[PDB]
């Protein structure tokens, strides 16, 4: 007929049956628009299959889902056509599912035979699985004939529709089953310890002298004297040459040796103390082990080792003022200015996000911690976490004693401040940007021992520790890649500009990484549903404009266009794999799910809807009867030839000898041309 029913979306082009020139004008618009939609569906179904790949990340259970993903155009078109057109069986949906089987079984398999490189074969390793699955796919189209012609002919019942749908879970369970199981003595005077240790700031060191043995009811006279070791008398210790007397009944005496303190860094030094001239008042007593002690001097005059407490600090943005601690760890002697500053990174300073600060904090003597006050400024907006940096500079030992200002060889102007430290007048360096009367200032302007003293005293300089750089972090792209990839050799330019509208439109699909592939899955299946709503309309109005039947336009055009996703899936598995299971199984898996979901769901919805109205669901069997029997007769020939290529002369289903490779491909293309030509004639009652 030349009269066009109104589609789901597209309105009827009016007036109807206008002329002969206008039919050519209208059908060209409908054909080019339909071919452009087929180009769009292949792009979005490729992305739909890639999302399924990510969700399930080569098994039969994984491949039956990929065969399900590429069959969405056939499955959705049959469901949309029934529900869109008031639950009435239309020719376009069932025929593009039966017509897809011919294209899948013959044309796709013929192409998979040929794409395998010359000299290489692809053999079905798992032949038991192939027999069961291929029989089930061919039975799907035989069972379609049964419900239309054998059991209650011309009508689809509720149980017929549901039983068609419930064969789909049988495909799912068999896939899971196949992976698990089908695939698989006189008195003596001596020291207590013999080696004492004291700090430099103690002032006195406590040694102990013990008399034991003989008779304790006697008097013992002994002398002690301190002699220089690596520490020198008058500079490091106080010289003492006292006398120790032991009363009768007394066994111990405490002697104290003074330690002269200063502020100069020194290494560990020691001195020797000796006892002799043991005498008794009124052989009897003599010195024994030990009689000489080595007393160490630990020196605490190191001016500090300056570090931040920790590398990374996490700060709430709505905070008034930070207090970063700068720790003077390894000692303290004299005031030491330590410059600091703020370095802005992501958290740009200048007052907008923090108040820029820099200055010269000054430690005092014997003060091991000070704080740096930087104030974060919060903002209303919710933004990304921002960072900025805090760094201290090289310290300066500003204040020192008189004699330590010679060892350090400071030649700047000096001030005599009031304070006294370890009994010595204490000077402080003049710093620029401060002004003296300039009468007040003193300017303080080798023997192989003095140079040693300078070298050791230059190890008490203020230095920087482990962490001199502290990061302050404030606390409250794949989309772009798709659009850059969307828009980017003459043949490539033709294909790029043809599909640039589709690639930019489908770059709004969420990237597959989100929601573990599900964000891409929901949006892709919606767009596939939208573009097969248009294809159902464009193919419907194309046929009635030129008088072509919906049976013919579905078999030739719509069936070929919706199997483009299936063709590339099988072609890649034919070449890249080692066997022919995945390539052929995608054809078999597609054919089964086309009937069980495409016709099973669509005719379940229609039969139930008419049953609620107490009415039968009538599908005319004659158009579909000859198509499904022509397919099964042609399918056994295809399956028979595939099994015949298992001989060692050929070696496998795919590839093989080049002369046999063309004959198998040309035969299967011939079977498809014979199918679509005979089916077109039977549609038009030419037998």
């Amino acid at each position: 007929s030349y009269y066009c029913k109104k589609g789901v979306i597209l309105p009827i082009w009016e007036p109807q049956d206008p002329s002969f020139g206008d039919k050519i004008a209208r059908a060209t618009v409908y054909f080019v628009a339909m071919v452009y939609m087929f180009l769009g569906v292949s792009i979005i179904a490729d992305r739909f299959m890639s999302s399924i790949e990510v969700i399930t990340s080569e098994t039969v259970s994984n491949l039956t889902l990929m065969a399900l993903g590429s069959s969405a155009p056939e499955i959705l078109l049959s469901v949309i056509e029934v529900c869109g057109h008031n639950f009435t069986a239309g020719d376009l949906g069932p025929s593009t599912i039966v017509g897809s089987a011919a294209f899948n079984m013959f044309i796709i398999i013929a192409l998979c035979v040929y794409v395998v490189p010359d000299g290489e074969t692809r053999k079905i390793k798992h032949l038991r699985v192939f027999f069961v699955t291929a029989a089930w796919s061919i039975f799907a189209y035989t069972w379609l004939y049964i419900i239309l012609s054998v059991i209650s002919p011309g009508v689809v019942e509720v149980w017929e529709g549901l039983l068609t749908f419930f064969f789909f879970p049988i495909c799912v369970v068999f896939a899971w089953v196949a992976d698990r199981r089908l695939l698989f003595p006189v008195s003596k005077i001596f020291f207590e310890q013999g080696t004492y240790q004291c700090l430099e700031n103690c002032g006195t060191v406590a040694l102990t002298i013990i008399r034991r043995g003989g008779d304790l009811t006697n008097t013992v006279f002994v002398d002690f004297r301190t002699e220089d070791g690596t520490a020198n008398a008058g500079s490091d210790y106080e010289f003492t040459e006292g006398t120790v007397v032991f009363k009768p009944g007394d066994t111990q005496k405490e002697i104290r040796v003074g330690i002269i303190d200063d502020d100069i860094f020194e290494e560990d030094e020691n001195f020797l103390v000796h006892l002799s001239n043991v005498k008794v008042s009124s052989t009897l007593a003599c010195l024994g082990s030990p009689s000489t002690a080595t007393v160490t001097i630990f020196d605490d005059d190191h001016a500090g080792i300056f570090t931040f407490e920790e590398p990374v600090t996490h700060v709430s943005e709505s905070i008034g003022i930070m207090e970063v601690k700068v720790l003077r760890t390894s000692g303290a002697r004299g005031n030491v200015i330590v410059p600091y500053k703020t370095i802005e990174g992501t958290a740009r300073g200048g007052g907008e996000d923090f108040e820029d600060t820099c200055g010269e904090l000054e430690f005092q003597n014997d003060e091991i911690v000070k704080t740096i006050s930087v104030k974060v400024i919060d903002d209303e907006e919710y933004e990304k976490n921002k960072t900025f940096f805090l760094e201290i500079g090289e310290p300066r030992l500003v204040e020192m004693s008189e004699k330590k200002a010679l060892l350090l060889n400071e030649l700047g102007g000096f001030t005599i401040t009031g304070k006294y430290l370890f009994g010595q007048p204490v000077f402080r360096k003049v710093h620029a940007r401060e002004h003296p009367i300039l009468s007040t200032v003193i300017t303080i302007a080798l023997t192989s021992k003095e140079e040693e003293e300078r070298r050791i005293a230059e190890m008490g300089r203020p230095i920087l520790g482990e962490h001199t750089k502290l990061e302050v972090i404030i606390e409250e792209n794949s989309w772009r890649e798709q659009f850059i990839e969307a828009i980017t050799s003459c043949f490539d330019y033709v294909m790029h500009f043809l599909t640039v509208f589709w690639k930019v439109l489908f770059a709004f699909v969420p990237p597959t990484e989100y929601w573990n592939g599900w964000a891409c899955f929901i949006v892709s299946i919606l767009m596939i549903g939208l573009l097969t709503a248009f294809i159902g309309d464009l193919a419907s109005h194309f046929g009635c404009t030129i008088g072509l039947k919906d049976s013919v336009t579905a078999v030739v055009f719509v069936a070929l266009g919706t199997s483009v996703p299936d063709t590339f899936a099988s072609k890649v598995a034919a070449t890249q794999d080692q066997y022919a299971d995945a390539s052929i199984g995608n054809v078999t898996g597609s054919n089964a799910v086309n009937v069980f979901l495409g016709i099973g769901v669509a005719w379940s919805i229609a039969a139930i809807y008419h049953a609620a109205n107490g009415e039968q669901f009538k599908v005319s069997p004659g158009t579909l009867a000859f198509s499904v029997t022509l397919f099964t007769i042609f399918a056994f020939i295809n399956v028979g030839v595939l099994l015949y290529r298992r001989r060692p002369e050929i070696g496998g289903e795919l590839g093989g000898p080049r002369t046999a490779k063309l004959l198998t491909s040309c035969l299967f293309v011939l079977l498809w041309l014979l199918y679509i030509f005979f089916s077109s004639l039977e549609a038009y009652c030419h037998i």
Epitope: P339, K341, I343, G393, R396, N409, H431, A432, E466, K469
Partner: antibody, heavy 121, light 110 residues
Framework: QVQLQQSGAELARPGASVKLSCKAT????????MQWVKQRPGQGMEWIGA????????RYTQKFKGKATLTADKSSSTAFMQLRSLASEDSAVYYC??????????????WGQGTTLTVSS | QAVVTQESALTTSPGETVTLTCRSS?????????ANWVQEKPDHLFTGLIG???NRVPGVPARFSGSLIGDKAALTITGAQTEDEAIYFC?????????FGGGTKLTVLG
């Protein structure tokens, strides 16, 4: 506009003393360290020391401690290096380099053009 | 006391990437050595490139980048021009005194 004007070429006899002057202009002299670097052809470069012209705080390596004395003159914005007891190995090129005082930044931001010192008789 | 070692010379071509090495004798350079890179142009024109192993001097072109690779410091110039034909020195702090390298006389063909 930071420029460090290094002193002109010097010729001295061995055993004498020479004084070299890096006249720093273009920035805050009394808040930046000045580093002195010795370069000899084939022996790489040797760090002599650093001076802070603010309060005349000085740093030196052990071998250059008695050899070089670093001095500054904040009135005329010039830093000085005095070499004493000159010998044949002191024939080199001496550079002055600006340092902010922070190890996270470059210690050798801006250099002088260098004074060549010739010690021969 | 420690010695810093480099390449004697290392040629490259304009537009190509180049990596310069700086190895300490005591072992691996850490972030506490503060590896500095300076450059001399002919007739004694020195310029400071990189501070504490990452920080770049303002005004130094963005192609110069410093990093740590393995047990040694690295200067990488991505797409060097003819203007980068110079001698590059590396300095290590060693907590008391800067120790310089020998200098790589990088040369670019023209």
């Amino acid at each position: 506009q930071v420029q460090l004007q290094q002193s002109g070429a010097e010729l001295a006899r061995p055993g004498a003393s020479v004084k070299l002057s890096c006249k720093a202009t273009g920035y805050s002299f009394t808040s930046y360290w000045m580093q002195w670097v010795k370069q000899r052809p084939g022996q790489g470069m040797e760090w002599i020391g650093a001076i802070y012209p603010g309060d005349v705080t000085s740093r030196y390596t052990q071998k250059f401690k008695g050899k070089a004395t670093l001095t500054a003159d904040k009135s005329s914005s010039t830093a000085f290096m005095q070499l004493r007891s000159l010998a044949s190995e002191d024939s080199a090129v001496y550079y002055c380099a600006r340092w902010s005082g922070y190890y996270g930044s470059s210690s050798f931001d801006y250099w002088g053009q260098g004074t060549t010192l010739t010690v021969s008789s | 006391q420690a010695v810093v070692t480099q390449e004697s010379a290392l040629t490259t071509s304009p537009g190509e990437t180049v990596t310069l090495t700086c190895r300490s004798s005591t072992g691996a350079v850490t972030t506490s050595n503060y590896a500095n890179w300076v450059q001399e142009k002919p007739d004694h024109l020195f310029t400071g490139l990189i501070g504490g192993t990452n920080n770049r001097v303002p005004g130094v072109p963005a192609r110069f980048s410093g990093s740590l690779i393995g047990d040694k410091a690295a200067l990488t110039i991505t797409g060097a021009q003819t203007e980068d034909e110079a001698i590059y020195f590396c300095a290590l702090w060693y907590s008391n005194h800067w120790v310089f390298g020998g200098g790589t006389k990088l040369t670019v063909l023209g």
